[PDB]
Structure formats: structure tokens, C-alpha cells
């Protein structure tokens, strides 16, 4: 018997478990699918980055109707610390209107204003050295970055010289320096804040900052290498869970909570727990002979990710050193590793293949001459066309409300819809941050070891291709600007300067886009039940008591940026909500 059981030991699960166990009268069990990492160089050292160590095995998509029916390997964490243990350590808040929009969907107490103190509470920013800030153009607003919270973040202590050419090129094509991308807008270029502890130049993942930090606590229990297979009920009250070994041994165990069950199993895990437990669409549950506890057609609907594109380049005059010097120059690689091992300086403080700066842009910044044409197309098309016919009408209503919020974001000069990056080597990256497409994640069986059916439905909403084509063209502007032309870049096949029309460009993008940056969200959405929502504004699952969703399954839609910073802050916020209801310390 525990006070709380948390299903999943990732960013949201560990943050919540940490905060709840600050009260010695409160016991928590975190049940986590994956093992404890072993402090491998691939995890702790940015330059050694090896995310594949703890990928969840045997997840593959359905054929992707929007991407030439390609099937893709699905990437999500299976490890204590979840995504934080194996992600690229990119630490960015969303824009103000992301959180304001979540509130306006019918979620009282959700706004930029209510989130800011939880962003601050979550973290400790360590400033870079003054010479690197000056040379690098590293800026921040100390007033809105935390100084006392457990997540350490800072910057690498080095930049590849080519990052200078790219910064100036970006400035030449209307991506100006951003004072602080953590201040609720990020229109232009800025240094990437990195979830690194500057004392050791090592990863500050949730395993460290929300478990190891507090693991002397006898009330903070962890069970790695087990799966929560089902929620247990007395009537509509969630009272416990069944768990099994992740390795598939024919064993099942029941464990009980006096106060609540929290789901923290992520975008691809939480909906499976709900559906196996009879919380989900009665059509699916009836087909599988699962007794319905709560008929919620939103469970496993509204899947979102942030598609990526990798654009290959050749250079006649690239500057040495660059990120690819680490792979192609054994001498450079040895000297940089020796340097890191001695004085913790140099290229090994940067996540392997990344550079130090990045660019985010609104729709009107990407497409200043045409953004109103894209908005008109999106406005003209019924929200229902983005979903299969027969989609539950509550789910269509919630999608329409999300869509109307995103079209306002499209009109907003201060909300990002795309990211541009150049690692300093043979490729650039373009990320689509705000897809209008929605996918699904549904169980195929009652067997808790069976992968769910994962259908991203990337590029099914035709507006996504118009936005993404505009983002591609802006990246092309950066590479053609005078500061980059000195390095002699040219797009390589299957891209190329000879692809000049939207149709020629998008035909190649349809074959190369990745549905996912492992940013899966929004499959147990926080919206009103009559809008196809799964959880209330307090993250309580509709139709049952003592059951909440903490992981980014609860998000209505994707941010202007990567999810990690908000996964921490959203868990900080929920810890206080739970403490308030249950009168905890
Ligand atoms: C390789 C890679 C790279 C990136 C990213 C992810 C990944 C995998 N992301 C995304 C980001 O890390 C991710 O969105 C967050 O970790 C989500 O936090 P959650 O708490 O929702 O899930 P998270 O995935 O952290 O945790 C869920 C946990 O539940 C466990 N689990 C699932 N089913 C279970 C069950 N039935 N029982 C028990 N446990 C169960 C899983 O094992 C996992 O540890 C990212 N973001 C960003 O901002 N910056 C970045 O650089 C990156 N890069
Ligand atoms: C990571 O952030 C934590 C939390 O603010 C920092 O921990 C503090 O460290 C100082 C100096 O070691 C101590 O005097 C404080 O008592 C610590 N506070 C807590 C709550 O732990 C740590 O310094 C940060 N890392 C870096 C590089 O600054
Ligand atoms: C899925 C995973 N994604 C990341 O590492 C995030 C990467 C990320 O945010 C950024 C990279 C550059 C600027 S920002 C992954 C793993 C392996 C290969 N490809 C992708
Ligand atoms: C994808 O497969 C479907 C069959 O389900 C087919 O109708 C369609 O033409 C295919 N698309 C492409 C681009 O081949
Ligand atoms: C920093 O910005 C200045 C312009 O203010 C520019 O001259 C310089 O090249 C930039 N350096 C880097 C590394 O971005
Ligand atoms: C698991 O054990 C139970 C009880 O012995 C048994 O009924 C069932 O056949 C077993 N399942 C498998 C796959 O071994
Ligand atoms: C390889 O890296 C070393 C170490 O910095 C450098 O001296 C050398 O010029 C590099 N070789 C090439 C071919 O770039
Ligand atoms: Mg200093
Ligand atoms: Na409820």
C-alpha cells in the first residue's frame, strides 16, 4: 500500500514523485518500463551522444498515407528519466500564446502567466563565461530564468566557427538575434539552452535532477524494468495497478494506492494503459471485449509530433573545425576528447551533430509574401476533412477548436511554426513545429506486451505541406546569403538548386520527411469532454476518481518549440495541484 502510484518514470513521473515525497508522510511508487541507465559516456557526455541505448523496441508506424505510404521506426524512451535520459538536451519553453490557447480551450488556470513561476521553479540556469557570451552573441534575461530549481541548464563552452557564418546569414534574411527565447517569444536566432550541469559538463536528466538528488528518501520507491498493464477500480475509483516484467515473464502483481494513480507513460504509453483499463472509445473496447469503465472517444486520438527534414549539402570551402571533423578526423576527435577529459573544454560539450545556435520563425516571417494565402486555404477547409469520416463528433469539435487557435497563431508575428538549424557539417535540419495533421495510437489486442497501432498521419492535412515548403525556402535563403556563400554550399541530391517550384521541392520532402522527433503528445488531451477531451483542467480523467495524466499525453497541441522544458514545468504545476487537493506538505 502506497499513497500514490505513478505509471512511468520519465520526465513527468520523476518530477511529480520528487515533489510529492517532499512530504515524509507521502509514499510514492514509480513503476518504470526501462532500467536505470549505467552513467555510460553515451548518456552523460554531450559529444558521445548515443540515444539508441534506451529506445523502446519493436515500435513501427502504419504506412503513412501523407508520405508515400512509408512505414517508419517509432522512437520513444524506455529508461528511468524517459526522454530526458536520451534526448538532444534542447531546453526551450513554448511561446506565451501556446499556454494562453490551452486556457482558452476551456481550461481554467492555464496561461503563460500561471506557467512562468513553474518554469522558474523547475530549474537553475548557469550563465556561460563572459568571453563566450560576447564572442558567441549569447544573451538571456536573468529575471525569467530560474536560479534555485533542480534541472541544471546552461550552454556548451565552445562553438564551431561556421556557426558564425550561419548566424550572420540568418540575420541577412530576416532572422534577427533574440534577447531570450525563454521569455515567451523566439522570432529569429539564439543560442540553444542545453540541459547540462556546467560543473561536470554532463547531462542533467530527470534520473539525476528528480531521483538521484533525493534518493536518500525512504518514501520515494522505484521499480524499474516493469510495465503497468492495467488500472484497478472499486466502481469508478482508481485504487491500484497490475504490473508485469517488461521482459514478458508470465507474472502479474497488484499494488494499491490510498490517494491516486498517476499515468506518466508518455504519448505512446498512457493511452494504452487507459484503453487496456476500459477507459477509451467504446467502439475499440467493444471490438476487443474490454468492459467499458469510461467511454472517452478522445483516448488515443489527436496524436501529434514535430516532423523533421534533413537537407544534405556539399561545400567547396567549409571552415575547419566543424561537427564533421569529429567523425572524419581521428586526430581532431582524440584531441577534443583529451581536452574534455582534462579541462572539460571544447567540442565534446556540444551534443554530437548539433551546433550552438538555432532559428525559429512565425508563418509571416517564413512566408512574408504568401502567409495570407496559406491562412485563407486553412480557414476555407472544414476541420472535419483532417480526420477520417466517422470520427466521433466530440473529437471533431475539439480538433476544430485547436485548429481555430492554430490559425490565430498563423496570424501572430510572435508565435513560431518552424525551426532551422545547421550542425556546421553536411546537413541542415528544418522542423515543422505546428502541424494541423492528427494521428492515432490504439491497442490492437488485450495483451499488455503487444505494441499499439501507431499512425502519425503526417502530411494528411494538405496545409502542412504549404507551411513546410515555406520553411524549406527560408532555409534556402540562409544558405544563399553572403555570409554562407563564402563557404560555397550547394544542396545535394535529392535536393538541388534545380528544384525551383513548390511541386518539385515538396515531391522530395514527401519522400524524406520524418513524422517524428520523438515529440509524441496530445493523445489524452486536456479539453472539455464534449470537445473529445480525456482530462479536466486539473488533469483528472473524465468519469473516474483518483486518476490523472501527468505526461505530455495531456497537451491539446504542440508548442512553439521542443517539449522537454514544459514536461518538467507542467509536472511542477501538477505536484502543487495534487498537494492542494490532498492537503500535503
Ligand atoms: C531521442 C529523443 C530525442 C529528443 C526527445 C525525445 C527522444 C526520445 N525529445 C522529446 C522529449 O524528451 C519528450 O517529449 C519528453 O521526455 C516527454 O516527457 P513525458 O514525461 O511525457 O514522457 P517520457 O517519454 O519522458 O517518459 C515516459 C516513460 O514511461 C515509460 N512507460 C511507458 N509505458 C509504460 C508502462 N505501461 N508502464 C511503465 N512505464 C511505462 C517509458 O519507459 C518512459 O520512460 C526532446 N525534447 C526536447 O525538448 N529536447 C530535445 O532535445 C529532445 N530530443
Ligand atoms: C544545479 O542547480 C542546483 C540547484 O540550484 C545547484 O545547487 C546549489 O549549489 C550550490 C553550490 O554548490 C549550493 O551552495 C546550494 O546549496 C545548492 N542548492 C540546491 C538546492 O541544491 C547547483 O549548483 C547547480 N549546478 C551548477 C553548475 O550551478
Ligand atoms: C528523435 C531524435 N531527436 C533528437 O535527437 C532531437 C534533435 C534536436 O532537437 C535538434 C537537433 C539539432 C538541433 S535541435 C533523433 C535521434 C537520432 C537521430 N535523429 C533524431
Ligand atoms: C498508398 O496506398 C493506398 C492504398 O491504401 C493507395 O490508394 C495510394 O495510391 C498509395 N499512395 C501512394 C502515393 O502510392
Ligand atoms: C555575433 O554578432 C555580431 C554582430 O553583432 C557578428 O559580427 C558576429 O560575427 C557574431 N558572432 C557569432 C559567433 O554569432
Ligand atoms: C501463465 O500462468 C497461468 C497460471 O499458471 C496460466 O494459466 C497461463 O497458461 C500462463 N500463460 C503463459 C503464456 O504461460
Ligand atoms: C585534423 O585535425 C588536426 C587536429 O586539430 C588538424 O591539425 C589537422 O589539420 C586536421 N586534418 C585535416 C585534414 O583537416
Ligand atoms: Mg560565471
Ligand atoms: Na473525473
Residue numbers in the entry: 46 to 630
Please share excerpts from the published article on this structure.
The FAD-dependent oxidoreductase from Chaetomium thermophilum (CtFDO) is a novel thermostable glycoprotein from the glucose–methanol–choline (GMC) oxidoreductase superfamily. However, CtFDO shows no activity toward the typical substrates of the family and high-throughput screening with around 1000 compounds did not yield any strongly reacting substrate. The structure of CtFDO reveals an unusually wide-open solvent-accessible active-site pocket with a unique His–Ser amino-acid pair putatively involved in enzyme catalysis. A series of six crystal structures of CtFDO complexes revealed five different subsites for the binding of aryl moieties inside the active-site pocket and conformational flexibility of the interacting amino acids when adapting to a particular ligand.
